[PDB]
Ligand binder design. Structure first.
Ligand SMILES: [Mn+2]
Ligand SMILES: [Mn+2]
Ligand SMILES: [Mn+2]
Ligand SMILES: [Mn+2]
Ligand SMILES: [Mn+2]
Ligand SMILES: [Mn+2]
Ligand SMILES: [Mn+2]
Ligand SMILES: [Mn+2]
Ligand SMILES: [Mn+2]
Ligand SMILES: [Mn+2]
Ligand SMILES: [Mn+2]
Ligand SMILES: [Mn+2]
Lengths: 316, 316, 316, 316, 316, 316
């Protein structure tokens, strides 16, 4: 017995209660022990430097997800034949105190990994990834990283404060959470202050791929290099939506011109097949800055492709 | 131990799964036997004559309802300390055949009344009220009526067809479902073909109140006349959203200028206190014609006022 | 046989070619000689001082008019049983030269009045009313006036130029076109420079009714006073849409807070019954500043009430 | 005599009555006999499975078409010098009964072909193509097909019903309307249930081209293979708007990510030159789900390119 | 010499740098000494319980203000002939730490009062009023209060925290900042938990005026009673925009149905003439939840009426 | 010391007065003589032939520009370490008379060049470029030109008038302002009347590059040929926003399908390095036809790339 999404011949897709992919809602400790993987949300926006609004991200992603079917026509992957999956709700953060919210997040992820669940996370601003990595290292050790973004996110401070959505990866290196020689950053562009704005990462041991190197091309051959750099151990995956061009994704906090296409984004995720993935996330979707709901529709479709490449999924 | 809505100190209101008023989702036969009343939806729009879109009605009303609290500051009513209430989901209609859909509605409402539950319905176009009244009459006998609308809805045909959203109450009289001496219609205005468009109702025994009789006035004295006319037995309440002026409710299928205010709408519902109510509905909300979400927020608040005046509710 | 609008049982109201009220389109010399009244448009916006866009006015009004039925339930008026009416198209203005556009307008209205037709005009900014009144005097002589607006429109100049949308009624007085002892202005409010901004009109002989005199009241008693002041000869009616409060009409060039309601606007037009009317207009609707289409819908419904009160209409 | 679109020096393009490309409206029997080709509309949406609204499709396409000029700069084609063309209105469907509407469509297309006119159709959902093909076969016999879509549309049933917008081309094979060896389908993608969802078509004799085969490329060499396959007889062209990526076409019923560009769409239509075309259509545009009008403007421009490639048109 | 706003005959109102009412921007110490009053902004939103976005409040209010003229036609007030006024910019808050932001606000207002300036403040959420009152008391002593809102704002905690946007006036009583016998609250409505939610304020010494007491009437007689209650010393004025009905002001954080009109709001402010006012504010405007820009336009016009009633203004 | 833009550690980017890139505002004769270059605006829209609204162009471009940082990561350019730059305001045009507005433009640009300043212009419709070139020729002599557009703009007349937004470059040839052997036009497409619509330019000595020559290609090799053709003397750059595909830039007056990408636009500007540029402009942005603000954000970012390639700028 494995859980399945609701079909159109059972109930029309414009109706029914709106969970992720119309799946069952599980809460008890006894039933949590029987799951292989699960969807979960974290509604925080008090770490933003420009536009707010990403507190409503998890709700709109769930609402648009009612269109998706179970079997992948292009690759042949069928995850609902192999694994047991469900929707487990949201985390209750403190919206009036930032450092108190960070404490709560680490505590709840300690409980999830205790039951043996691999998480797929709906955000939320980029500050959330720091306390998540604190719990991951306690279970697995030092990890590798594949990071998609329009910004490097390695600032020393923001308005004199140490913890914010632009300092996440500077803190991770200082706390000894990563294996520095197994890291790649893809999509960096736009303006800065000095040449050291990209050169600091290269000196630590990272490989940096700017958007100019991606223009006019397919990224199928590039991912062979990426597998060579990060492989030979456990790996985490983190995706910022502002990496994609605003023609496809207008609903976000800090947009930048001339970026990646949606075809190119599909080539990256499908090319992760063969790695030892231990967790994934999708961040920075902001509903009040897109009227059509198209940005949220894109996020749900990319989360489906992530499930398809987890270890143990059969092809038919 | 009665059901209660989720509080803001447990989980912030922009988070959590979106059921009506964030209540439990009841599905088992044993749990259905223990309920006094419940919210339920019917997503149909294939009976409309102008704009479509009311199939998404029940989904948006649930989403905006997250801000309602349980105690009435003005009247003192407290329904959740008196009755056992929950959310029971949607009815699975056939969107490709209109006559088959009408059959499905009567069948499912026969089962709901079998468990001993009083229904509060979310629509959906005005064709739904006909098969609902068929099930009511079998249980209680002939009933009275309070009807709020900008139109009469008593046409003999529409493009040659007998069953449509503008013929509902003509069919109800021919089938012997109503007590003709206990009926009132409130809000009628705009254009027609001849004088018989309003005079047909008066001939059958109904009392008609045109919008011109409502301008510049408080409606507390009017509702005293209403209670004297329709009292002495059981009664049903049916509310079309297009009775209210488009300045307050722009998202609907057939709008008409110069109508009732939201202050006057509150005076109507609160004035039903004392009657033997056996069921209620709220129809014709259409999401894609109002981008702010304000029309759906209005609908959720009015449904709460309806719950406060049911028989058996205590005051503190 | 007289012309009739297209009915619903002939073709559904969402289809068909989009003329005003779905009426015939008339062009020949013989067919023009046989009409008692007609609808006509003038698409000009090069005389505006803040927001532009009223050039699209005539097109959106026609599109929202498809809802209107032919008989008046409240008053009993039936215009299509007594008069011969149709749609005669638009005037071909020069959008690159303002003074040349003014010359074209006077010439074409000389032709319309030569056929014996009474015009009902769709605008367009308020500059159009000057060359229209020039043609009216040639046929009828000096006339009285009923004027609804939030502004006085009696400036001596605008950026040094003599002809603009805020100088219209200053020029009409200087050119000896009006009977000064038969004029009323209704709805003026907001800010100015000195007390003479409203007092100049009073010195000429006009009556001025400020918005403060209208607050909280029905306007039926006021219109009894108005009829005795302006009666005894021919009269023209001119309606600027910014007279109505922005809660009902946001799509306009220069809006002002705290104005008249739609109920009050209906009381003004219905109270003109009994006067010798020779022409009417409805100006300043701007489509790109209202996304719902509600401002254009209000405009079409008010023009129908204007048709109902013309001399020669039968009651049934 | 030859019909021509209205020029800018006669009347500014934001003015005048809104027919397709501002052409004459033809209604009499004598004038219908003299036409070589014509534009016509069918406003139906009661066969949709997700979002509704394509009933307003034909009205918005006409309104945005006021921009187009007669001469093709790239190809040298000039259709208005070789053929006599006009706008003939809409078909009067029954919006309360699906099977009754299907009967009406076949009967009215029998009359159109009786005058000897070649049709270019504005939709409307994809159910309309079935009864159109029933009428075409009676005049020409069995035909070949070029089909552009994101979906296969070969279902056996939908919620138990045989006639719906996803069963169209399954019914055509069973009724013997096509030559199975002269058919191509271009653009299919996304999720399904089993591998047989694409392989059923291949077993019948069709060639299938998935979106992955199209990425990063020019489509000029592909269309040379297409002309060889379907040539040697009469052929029909059918275009579903959801074949194009949502970055360009957000206003539609069932969107899917990562599709074709507008450059690739022009390469397909221009590549049909030399074939014996007998009819064309453009379906599934839904106005209430796009807030700019950009989806309707694209539809109007693609229909102009279809006109340029008909037999009889000369190059200069 | 006194500062004046820019006129239309110098530069058209759609052009020029967008300061408040197009006034000079003052920065130097010597020029600050010579001002009688000034406009100033505080862009904070990290204290909100539901919707965020009021950080952009000050920017949109400035842009919509380019319409206002200097002389009051109804009251005859002329503030620019009596006082010296300008725009002085924004306060630089810390958006990553809430308690540090409160410290910064108190320090800067100590400086503004040191130059001898009376402040008119643009917000910003309701947490800002607490540090402002801490600075007022040092100069003047304890003060009276006129407060317009749909909520009481007297909570002890929010999610366990003492300082938030719903606890403002509870902290003010504890710290001895007010004279409890000279306070009035106007406009409270909707749902709660117990009767004590409104009863606490009555026992302290306040007068409470619910929305039900205001329905259907003019507020001229009420304001005469208010002047008697709060007169005798210095007084502050605080205006929450959610006190007005959502038909006029949809762009706000926590909306509630059935409220005050804009006519009633005008009667309140104009009725303050004669009191010893020492400061004013206008809070909670949120731009991303109102696309038209009408909520911001309302806020700018209400601020002008506040300037007219300050002590020392002449009438002509 | 040279002028610098404001940083985030001084004041958060959602606050502060909105000048271009948050730079100082310069007005005095003494401070003007000290500037090497400056930003300046011209708000005209009375010469358009379809949609109006580009009068608000300069205001929205300023508001979105608050995001830009000073150092170019890709090229290494640093303009703020080399040149002295500021914001100098708008030109006061006559919105009621087109010919008088043209006289005003030429006069003010004579004064700007008299101070020795190189201009970077914000528009405004394409009529403004004619009077600008009249003042340029008086100072420098005959000049070369790089022109980006979807249209040729070489009409002899519009509606009988010789000065309009589509005749600009025809007038420039007749008045002897250009070196005809040093001109290139890039991006022309869509429909016309005859083959001479593009062939007139070829006969004068121009090179024409149509859109079909740009499809599927990088534009680096093209710009090497362009530099050879126009070099060896002073040169002007003019950029019409409708040259880019409507997927990226929907807010414009006359849009055409299937154009250039934003990647291709970046390759054009960066490829101008090495030329003797004397002035630049960016025209035809219309805010009310794009609600997201994305069209204005694109315009601001392109103007920064123009500043980076001026003679005298150093690389690091
Ligand atoms: Mn980023
Ligand atoms: Mn990031
Ligand atoms: Mn109705
Ligand atoms: Mn109804
Ligand atoms: Mn006005
Ligand atoms: Mn006016
Ligand atoms: Mn499809
Ligand atoms: Mn299809
Ligand atoms: Mn409040
Ligand atoms: Mn408050
Ligand atoms: Mn152009
Ligand atoms: Mn141009």
């Amino acid at each position: 017995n494995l859980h399945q999404p609701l079909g159109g011949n059972e109930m029309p897709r414009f109706g029914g209660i709106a969970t992720m992919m119309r799946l069952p809602h599980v809460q008890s400790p006894a039933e949590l022990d029987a799951l292989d993987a699960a969807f979960v949300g974290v509604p925080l926006d008090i770490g933003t430097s420009l536009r707010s609004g990403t507190r409503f991200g998890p709700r709109e992603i769930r609402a648009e997800s009612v269109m998706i079917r179970p079997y992948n026509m292009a690759t042949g992957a069928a995850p609902f034949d192999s694994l047991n999956v469900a929707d487990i709700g949201d985390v209750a953060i403190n919206t009036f105190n930032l450092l108190e919210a960070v404490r709560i997040i680490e505590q709840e992820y300690d409980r999830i990994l205790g039951h043996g669940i691999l998480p797929l996370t709906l955000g939320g601003d980029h500050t959330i990834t720091l306390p998540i990595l604190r719990a991951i290292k306690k279970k697995h050790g030092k990890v590798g990283l594949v990071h998609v973004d329009a910004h490097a996110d390695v600032n020393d401070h923001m308005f004199g404060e140490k913890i914010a959505h632009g300092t996440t990866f500077r803190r991770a290196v200082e706390e000894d959470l990563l294996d520095c020689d197994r890291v790649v950053q893809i999509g960096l562009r736009a303006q800065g202050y000095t040449a050291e704005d990209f050169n600091w990462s290269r000196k630590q041991g990272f490989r940096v791929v700017q958007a100019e190197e991606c223009w006019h091309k397919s990224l199928e051959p590039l991912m062979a290099e990426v597998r060579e750099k990060v492989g030979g151990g456990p790996v985490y995956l983190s995706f910022d939506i502002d990496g994609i061009d605003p023609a496809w994704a207008p609903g976000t906090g800090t947009p930048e011109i001339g970026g990646l296409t949606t075809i190119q984004a599909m080539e990256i995720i499908r090319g992760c097949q063969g790695l030892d993935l231990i967790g994934c996330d999708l961040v920075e979707v902001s509903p009040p800055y897109d009227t059509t709901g198209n940005t949220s529709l894109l996020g749900a479709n990319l989360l489906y492709e992530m499930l398809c490449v987890l270890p143990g999924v059969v092809r038919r």
